[PDB]
Design a protein around this ligand. Sequence first.
Ligand SMILES: Nc1ncnc2c1ncn2[C@@H]1O[C@H](COP(=O)(O)OP(=O)(O)OP(=O)(O)O)[C@@H](O)[C@H]1O
Ligand SMILES: Nc1ncnc2c1ncn2[C@@H]1O[C@H](COP(=O)(O)OP(=O)(O)OP(=O)(O)O)[C@@H](O)[C@H]1O
Ligand SMILES: [Ca+2]
Ligand SMILES: [Ca+2]
Lengths: 345, 357, 26
Amino acid sequence: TALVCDNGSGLVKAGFAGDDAPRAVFPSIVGRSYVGDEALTLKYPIEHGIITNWDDMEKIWHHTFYNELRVAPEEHPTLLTEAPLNPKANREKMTQIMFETFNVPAMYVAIQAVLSLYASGRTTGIVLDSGDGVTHNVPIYEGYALPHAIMRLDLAGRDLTDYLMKILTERGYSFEREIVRDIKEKLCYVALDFENEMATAASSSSLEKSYELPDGQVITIGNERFRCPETLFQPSFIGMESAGIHETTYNSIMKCDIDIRKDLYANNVMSGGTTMYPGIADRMQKEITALAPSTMKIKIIAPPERKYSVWIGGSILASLSTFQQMWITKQEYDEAGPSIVHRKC
Amino acid sequence: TTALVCDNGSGLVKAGFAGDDAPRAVFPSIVGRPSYVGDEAQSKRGILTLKYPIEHGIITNWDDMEKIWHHTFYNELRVAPEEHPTLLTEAPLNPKANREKMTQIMFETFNVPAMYVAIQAVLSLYASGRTTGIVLDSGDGVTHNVPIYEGYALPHAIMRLDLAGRDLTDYLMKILTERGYSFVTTAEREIVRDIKEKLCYVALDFENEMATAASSSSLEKSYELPDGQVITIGNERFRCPETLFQPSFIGMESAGIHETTYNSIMKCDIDIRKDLYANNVMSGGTTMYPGIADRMQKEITALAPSTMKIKIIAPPERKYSVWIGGSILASLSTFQQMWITKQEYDEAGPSIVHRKC
Amino acid sequence: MAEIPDMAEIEKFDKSKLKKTETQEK
Ligand SMILES: Nc1ncnc2c1ncn2[C@@H]1O[C@H](COP(=O)(O)OP(=O)(O)OP(=O)(O)O)[C@@H](O)[C@H]1O
Ligand SMILES: Nc1ncnc2c1ncn2[C@@H]1O[C@H](COP(=O)(O)OP(=O)(O)OP(=O)(O)O)[C@@H](O)[C@H]1O
Ligand SMILES: [Ca+2]
Ligand SMILES: [Ca+2]
């Protein structure tokens, strides 16, 4: 049975190919060693989607195989994921570690956004992938991520959590980060018209929500609910000079050839935890339509399970019969070494 | 309809039709201006400034390269590019921007229906009936050691030496002039190249060969010049290609081709080394010297573990091995999915070349 | 994509089946 391991900046998602969801999800953190929930110096071995601390990453993979999945790595072909534009040397190191440290019989590395596209049943389209540490726009043609049109924005879930902390502090609260992250995931949403939502928030009977803290205090969140993820559309909210995710989507499409643009516009796939906000699909539909030619058909695909789309795409790919030839085998690794990953991935 | 194969080198273009056992046309990779290409430029080099658009295997002048490709399609092969899938060749470790530029020119300038770019040494390996082995490719401008596993050139182990046939011709000119002869005009350079290709050889043991050339006339050959003068060539016969093994002969501080071969193998994983040693394929015009295969066998044997089975493969047609490998590849049924089509190009642009090549 | 040997042909290829052709070279 093939394993699928989707390593993110904030979360590891891991499971078995053919399953419709990852069995294990845990924090991508190492403390010094302690891994995940049980984690001292805290470190994130993956920063903005890129593995930067290899000793800690091996601790993560060890924890994934043995402690979380309770498997023997040598018995399972293993599909790993990587960020768009991951440096060549990083892909080789991942390959080296899987074969030499964990002795897998076979492995493969797939681009995260491409897997998300596959999970929606498409091989051409443009993916907005937004997680804990990074947001990407990735236009894809027949399974090939178009390298000159990929956009990267270092604004994602962790920044939104930090911002929610900041604006709650503005009203007299004191922060505890893990609590705010929970408030973010449960109560936040994207306003369809931000300025209108701000102006009308005082008279809404629906917008105030109470949240019970662990020690029992009941606190109230009002317009912070939609101000927090508004940051995705207005990065200036946190002092960042980038265009918002609607504009980076448009800009990415405009870096592709005109012949493919209709298909990109009609196959906008949203992926990742930070795309989970209620209202975000309709807000995107509005914003992209305003930028696009009026004759363009625009479609936002936002599956309910899109928090796990990358992993699900991997589960699907690793189950395909046409994919089985694509595995890098232990024998091939033994002959060619880590650079063999560029032959098949 | 037939696919074209165009093998662009530093000194020579080899061009023809997939399925043929040899290129239809072979001509100098030169562009001349007071524009003229190839043969018609070297026959007019008096009124012309000559330029080589490919240096050490790498395209460096895109304007002149388009003129070469134009000359190849229309003047040499006499085809309309838009009717023929075209396979091109490239050097190992060719920069990505170059592969994209090559793709852009083929689709947008020449409107080919489909194209592909293959690594030259890999094609040579294919021509010998192998998909794993290590290629020594030595042409006019560059020499490479290229270890290959199942058609994949192993990038960390590829070695490059900027010493090849042009340098050897220049060096032979120099040492023949030292012996009292005169070779200065461009026409006289062609004479030296003829002598190089006809009378030179690689000594099995250089120092013993020098000693032997010094104590008797037994290694001497005569060569008739165009005017009818007969001249004698002695130790210059093997001193000239000895430069491949001793680059210090022309002041270059690199290791010779035996050592770079060994060094390349040692940059590969231990499990594949046995197969590399037994599958040393020589490719290119500058591997044609009599004695070179046997000298390589000797030198690699001296460097390798004593138990290692060492085999040097030197095909008679190795002047054209790259081209022949391209002709074979473009003829395979399993290859036809591999073509990059104009339709794909319209969608993805030049970076589509990284999807298939 | 709908769901969402190469080397053997080279190794066994018969070069005698390639067409003879005249090479032009000065
Ligand atoms: N319902 C929700 N609403 C808003 N945000 C959510 C929700 N569920 C999870 N998140 C956020 O999604 C982020 C994690 O998502 P994901 O697993 O896609 O990221 P990652 O893969 O770890 O990071 P990256 O892809 O940036 O490297 C966290 O910031 C988390 O707070
Ligand atoms: N019989 C021979 N003996 C020695 N040298 C030869 C012989 N035949 C050709 N050469 C040399 O081979 C060179 C051309 O070889 P080839 O066509 O393989 O090179 P290229 O592909 O133009 O250049 P490169 O591969 O370096 O970019 C010329 O220098 C020529 O003098
Ligand atoms: Ca992710
Ligand atoms: Ca060549």
